Amino acid sequence: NNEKNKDIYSKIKVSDSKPIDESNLAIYQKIDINKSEKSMPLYRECIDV
RNA sequence: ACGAGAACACGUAUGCCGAAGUAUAUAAAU
Secondary structure (H helix, E strand, O other), X not given: OOOOHHHHHHHOOOOOOOOXXXXXXXXXXXXXXXXXXXXXXXXXXXXXX
């Protein structure tokens, strides 16, 4: 419940990621999973499985 | 025919001689 997590935010440091080669990149369609699976108009580049 | 008349307070040398605008302290926490 934000245990002053604004404070601890400074004391834990995360580096950026190392490179990810292309063979692990894919294009996917955004799908609205619901009672009837819908399809969003646009697509995305995202990391593969 | 004036206790008068003549007589450069002159001539030599300079502000020097050594020193550091120096001493640490993240353009920072989303």
